[PDB]
């Protein structure tokens, strides 16, 4: 669950990744909405944009990219401060369960998409001990997020 080594491997990798916050977050979102056009339903601005071209460029989408990337950054950066991470995700988890009401599973799905991009950006040096280190940040994120959902006794509505 993220050694000292792992924590730095992920950290360096994301560092070079976040220095591109902009295009990378957008590529993730746009790609998430193409694979699962139904998570687009939660966004009142994309619920209808179907052409990933309109998306790719849109300043709002770019905004939600800004947010997702920023939050992840805080997690990754304070990845050694159990408390800090637990907090950013609790805050993020409850906002999505109670305010936006995104069914929890999308998180896991959205995380895979994120790693897919990471793995592509570093297809050059994506080692087993490193890919294995990202799988943790992934499982760490989700469980934390579903803990928030669980604590609020989440039920999605009809
Ligand atoms: C990687 C994990 C995610 C992070 C860090 C994240 C982060 C954020 C942040 C920081 C905001 C700002 C608003 C606030 O905090 O209340 C936000 C809004 C929002 N997020 Fe996420 N999010 C994540 C995943 C998702 C997923 C998987 C969905 C589902 C499809 C989603 C749907 C939304 C919606 C619908 C809003 C409100 C957007 C709007 O209407 O302006 N988020 N998110």
């Amino acid at each position: 669950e993220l050694s000292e080594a792992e924590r730095k491997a992920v950290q360096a990798m994301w560092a070079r990744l976040y220095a591109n916050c902009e295009d990378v977050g957008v590529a993730i979102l746009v790609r998430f909405f193409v694979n699962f056009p139904s998570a687009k339903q939660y966004f009142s601005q994309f619920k209808h944009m179907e052409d990933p071209l309109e998306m790719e460029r849109s300043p709002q989408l770019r905004k939600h990219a800004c947010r997702v990337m920023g939050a992840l950054n805080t997690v990754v950066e304070n990845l050694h401060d159990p408390d800090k991470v637990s907090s950013v995700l609790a805050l993020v988890g409850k906002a999505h369960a109670l305010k936006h009401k995104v069914e929890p599973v999308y998180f896991k799905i959205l995380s895979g998409v994120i790693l897919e991009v990471v793995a592509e950006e570093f297809a050059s040096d994506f080692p087993p001990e490193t890919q294995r280190a990202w799988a943790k940040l992934r499982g760490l994120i989700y469980s934390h997020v579903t803990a928030a959902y669980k604590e609020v006794g989440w039920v999605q509505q009809v």
Side-chain angles (χ1 to χ4, degrees):
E1 349 300 324
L2 286 300
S3 88
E4 201 139 7
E6 285 174 334
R7 211 188 285 163
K8 312 248 261 177
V10 174
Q11 225 148 30
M13 225 152 137
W14 167 268
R16 287 174 275 182
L17 226 295
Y18 190 61
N20 267 302
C21 142
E22 304 106 327
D23 285 0
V24 167
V26 165
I28 289 181
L29 247 51
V30 174
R31 234 160 97 169
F32 172 60
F33 292 144
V34 163
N35 294 164
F36 301 88
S38 328
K40 208 166 43 182
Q41 70 169 296
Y42 299 110
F43 293 93
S44 54
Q45 356 153 31
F46 318 132
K47 65 184 181 213
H48 266 120
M49 284 200 326
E50 269 164 338
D51 170 45
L53 184 61
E54 286 146 46
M55 275 150 42
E56 235 248 44
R57 74 183 166 240
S58 140
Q60 254 139 276
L61 192 289
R62 303 230 121 218
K63 168 171 60 66
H64 306 301
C66 187
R67 326 251 196 187
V68 172
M69 294 282 116
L72 294 178
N73 197 64
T74 296
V75 167
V76 187
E77 296 293 59
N78 302 266
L79 199 48
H80 55 94
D81 191 344
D83 280 39
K84 206 67 131 243
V85 183
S86 181
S87 169
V88 177
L89 267 16
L91 283 42
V92 169
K94 321 224 158 209
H96 291 70
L98 309 179
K99 283 176 172 286
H100 325 300
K101 315 155 181 289
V102 169
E103 69 177 307
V105 78
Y106 278 116
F107 262 95
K108 198 201 181 213
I109 304 178
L110 208 238
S111 291
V113 174
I114 294 169
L115 252 70
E116 286 179 52
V117 182
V118 161
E120 268 163 26
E121 286 295 68
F122 300 99
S124 58
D125 226 321
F126 198 45
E129 229 274 292
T130 284
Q131 67 197 209
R132 199 190 284 143
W134 272 95
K136 295 188 176 193
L137 202 249
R138 207 186 66 216
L140 175 168
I141 291 181
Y142 192 51
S143 59
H144 261 68
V145 161
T146 62
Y149 273 64
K150 191 274 296 177
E151 285 167 39
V152 305
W154 188 85
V155 167
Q156 90 148 69
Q157 308 281 16
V158 152

